[PDB]
Design goal:
Its EC number is 4.6.1.24. The chain is an alpha+beta fold and 103 residues long. It has one helix and seven strands. It is 17% helix and 27% strand. It is globular. Bound molecules: guanosine-3',5'-diphosphate.
Length: 103
């Protein structure tokens, strides 16, 4: 696993595929789903990402398919304005409604 979000195993290609879809919607000024993804990720957690902000979050699914406006699940891909990967985060293993980084 390139990224492990709890029990979910993601390859660098799974991440790139998810990021490409979120980035396209972001550039178009459109959102999908009840929680309006992609949307700004403020970094309340204070992760030390090595790429510049603003950051946007988009769901990454354990099933392998691109988020299509339904349930977002626990996992997210975080990218910036230049389509650079900031990180992969999850609610799994975090307290409250916070996120932890996938390893
Ligand atoms: N845990 C966490 N959730 C975030 C972060 N940024 C955005 N979110 C979630 O996305 C929601 C919508 O994002 P937005 O703020 O960019 O519009 C936020 O709602 P709240 O505004 O109630 O915090 C929050 O629940 C962040 O840095 N950490």
């Amino acid at each position: 696993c390139d990224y492990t979000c709890g029990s979910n195993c993601y390859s660098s290609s799974d991440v790139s595929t998810a990021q490409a879809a979120g980035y396209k919607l972001h550039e178009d000024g459109e959102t999908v789903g009840s929680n309006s993804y992609p949307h700004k990720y403020n970094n309340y957690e204070g992760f030390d990402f090595s790429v510049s902000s603003p950051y946007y979050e988009w769901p990454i699914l354990s099933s392998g398919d691109v988020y299509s406006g339904g349930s977002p699940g626990a996992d997210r891909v975080v990218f910036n304005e230049n389509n650079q990967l900031a990180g992969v985060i999850t609610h799994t293993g975090a307290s409250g409604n916070n996120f932890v980084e996938c390893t």
